[PDB]
Design a protein around this ligand. Sequence first.
Ligand SMILES: *[C@@H]1O[C@H](CO)[C@@H](O[C@@H]2O[C@H](CO)[C@@H](O[C@@H]3O[C@H](CO[C@H]4O[C@H](CO)[C@@H](O)[C@H](O)[C@@H]4O)[C@@H](O[C@@H]4O[C@H](CO)[C@@H](O)[C@H](O)[C@@H]4O)[C@H](O[C@H]4O[C@H](CO)[C@@H](O)[C@H](O)[C@@H]4O)[C@@H]3O)[C@H](O)[C@H]2NC(C)=O)[C@H](O)[C@H]1NC(C)=O
Ligand SMILES: *[C@@H]1O[C@H](CO)[C@@H](O[C@@H]2O[C@H](CO)[C@@H](O[C@@H]3O[C@H](CO[C@H]4O[C@H](CO)[C@@H](O)[C@H](O)[C@@H]4O)[C@@H](O[C@@H]4O[C@H](CO)[C@@H](O)[C@H](O)[C@@H]4O)[C@H](O[C@H]4O[C@H](CO)[C@@H](O)[C@H](O)[C@@H]4O)[C@@H]3O)[C@H](O)[C@H]2NC(C)=O)[C@H](O)[C@H]1NC(C)=O
Ligand SMILES: *[C@@H]1O[C@H](CO)[C@@H](O)[C@H](O)[C@H]1NC(C)=O
Ligand SMILES: *[C@@H]1O[C@H](CO)[C@@H](O)[C@H](O)[C@H]1NC(C)=O
Ligand SMILES: *[C@H]1O[C@H](CO)[C@@H](O)[C@H](O)[C@H]1NC(C)=O
Ligand SMILES: *[C@H]1O[C@H](CO)[C@@H](O)[C@H](O)[C@H]1NC(C)=O
Lengths: 94, 94, 104, 104
Amino acid sequence: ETQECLFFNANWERDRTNQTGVEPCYGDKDKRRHCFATWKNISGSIEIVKQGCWLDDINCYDRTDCIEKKDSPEVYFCCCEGNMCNEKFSYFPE
Amino acid sequence: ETQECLFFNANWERDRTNQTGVEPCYGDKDKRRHCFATWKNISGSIEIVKQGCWLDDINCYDRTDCIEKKDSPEVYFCCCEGNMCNEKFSYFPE
Amino acid sequence: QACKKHELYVSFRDLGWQDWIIAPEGYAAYYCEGECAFPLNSYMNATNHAIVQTLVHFINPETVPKPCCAPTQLNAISVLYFDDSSNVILKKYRNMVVRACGCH
Amino acid sequence: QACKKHELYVSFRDLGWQDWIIAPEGYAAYYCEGECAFPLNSYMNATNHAIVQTLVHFINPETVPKPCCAPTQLNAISVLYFDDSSNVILKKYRNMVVRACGCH
Ligand SMILES: *[C@@H]1O[C@H](CO)[C@@H](O[C@@H]2O[C@H](CO)[C@@H](O[C@@H]3O[C@H](CO[C@H]4O[C@H](CO)[C@@H](O)[C@H](O)[C@@H]4O)[C@@H](O[C@@H]4O[C@H](CO)[C@@H](O)[C@H](O)[C@@H]4O)[C@H](O[C@H]4O[C@H](CO)[C@@H](O)[C@H](O)[C@@H]4O)[C@@H]3O)[C@H](O)[C@H]2NC(C)=O)[C@H](O)[C@H]1NC(C)=O
Ligand SMILES: *[C@@H]1O[C@H](CO)[C@@H](O[C@@H]2O[C@H](CO)[C@@H](O[C@@H]3O[C@H](CO[C@H]4O[C@H](CO)[C@@H](O)[C@H](O)[C@@H]4O)[C@@H](O[C@@H]4O[C@H](CO)[C@@H](O)[C@H](O)[C@@H]4O)[C@H](O[C@H]4O[C@H](CO)[C@@H](O)[C@H](O)[C@@H]4O)[C@@H]3O)[C@H](O)[C@H]2NC(C)=O)[C@H](O)[C@H]1NC(C)=O
Ligand SMILES: *[C@@H]1O[C@H](CO)[C@@H](O)[C@H](O)[C@H]1NC(C)=O
Ligand SMILES: *[C@@H]1O[C@H](CO)[C@@H](O)[C@H](O)[C@H]1NC(C)=O
Ligand SMILES: *[C@H]1O[C@H](CO)[C@@H](O)[C@H](O)[C@H]1NC(C)=O
Ligand SMILES: *[C@H]1O[C@H](CO)[C@@H](O)[C@H](O)[C@H]1NC(C)=O
């Protein structure tokens, strides 16, 4: 299970959140929680847009690494299970 | 409208309530509230069983006196609208 | 046709329960009923789950049905009834009256 | 036949929304469906309003219908979508997932 994720918010100034820190998933045995990460990839240059906890999503069930599988996405997003799993993320098309 | 009723509880000892006092109807413009009274009539001898507030009941809409209309009831019950309307109650079959 | 609350008075006599409830004799209970469709507007007090399922329908009506109109807001009433020992008893019953309907 | 939650995955692609939501691609949404009848037991998570209306039916099925099976418990999901300005945005949506069904 997942109690916390790495949190990052590009838009921290306008949203009034901190910019990073750890976010509690408030994951308590009824519904699952995951972490996620979304970032942009300007030609191998990578900037994180957001990173956090992520309500139960049958798509990231049984995922312990963050690999995104969509071809050349405008924005990359991935989620995984497992604390701070969002810490590192990777890309590997299908 | 009705903000309060005369309250009486025969069964105050077992129920742990007071035996009399005024009960707030908690009547606030969404749903109506009334007062009611239920008592026994052993041959003109009268003993009150209960008296209180009474959630919205289309039967005691537009009632400002407590007259019970059922023939020779095992227990008499009546409700009315209007503060402490339950104070006095009466009987007059249909 | 649209989902709407409609009147319905129940009577404990009729319900059979006349000898046990002392009051009331019957109550304004109401009930929902009505279609709940595309494009489901305001006043259908619908849930997102409902809007989605509505469109899902509209694409493949073969999959999920349309949502049902059903209460979203219910009131308690009071009753006075006799107990096994024939004590008189007052209790308020949660969710017996339909205050408002919607899509579910 | 009995009222039960059933599976249904929505796909935002199919829903048409593929260019605006960034994630997820679709979700486990589910839906209720099933009869809700006499004598309506446990596991139908029914409301009193429902039991009454059930019997009312059973006396005069001509008056009120049977209650409809419809969610009583829904979960939010998260989504990530783009805003007019193409900022990336995360928001959680209340009531999109059906956790459990019942009689209403
Ligand atoms: C989503 O939720 C909302 C509430 O959260 C629900 O909306 C609700 O709709 C109901 C209708 O069932 C509203 O109550 C009723 O309103 C009607 C309209 O009349 C009004 O207009 C005149 C203006 O000239 C005002 O003077 C009145 O104050 C009145 O409020 C009212 O009168 C009706 O008359 C028409 C025919 O002309 C009929 O179609 C109606 O049936 C009704 O008779 C209603 O009074 C009657 O019904 C009530 C019980 O419902 C009785 O107790 C009355 O004595 C009378 O017989 C009634 O008050 C309700 O207020 C409204 N909520 C809002 C918007 O505030 C939606 O219904 C829900 N979506 C769905 C699908 O349910
Ligand atoms: C009134 O509310 C209550 C809850 O408030 C609802 O009751 C709920 O019923 C649901 C069914 O939709 C319960 O969840 C499901 O339970 C089944 C039963 O399997 C269980 O038994 C074995 C014992 O041998 C245990 O090992 C398991 O832990 C398990 O909990 C479960 O497995 C099912 O397998 C059968 C076939 O054999 C199917 O009929 C089911 O569809 C199901 O596959 C379910 O797991 C499956 O479905 C879930 C999603 O629902 C998936 O995520 C799983 O991976 C899998 O595919 C499922 O957990 C629920 O717990 C229960 N609540 C209670 C009582 O605690 C009532 O439904 C509601 N009334 C109505 C009308 O809805
Ligand atoms: C970023 O894109 C490069 C090529 O531009 C790719 O090889 C790399 O794996 C991507 N990094 C990410 C986001 O995983
Ligand atoms: C009580 O019963 C008497 C006759 O026994 C009747 O005339 C009187 O009005 C009743 N009092 C009540 C409860 O109203
Ligand atoms: C930063 O803001 C609060 C205020 O103390 C801080 O405690 C918290 O750890 C940070 N915020 C988030 C969203 O993680
Ligand atoms: C008596 O019990 C409480 C405790 O103070 C008292 O204040 C109240 O007025 C009485 N009870 C009722 C039900 O009216």
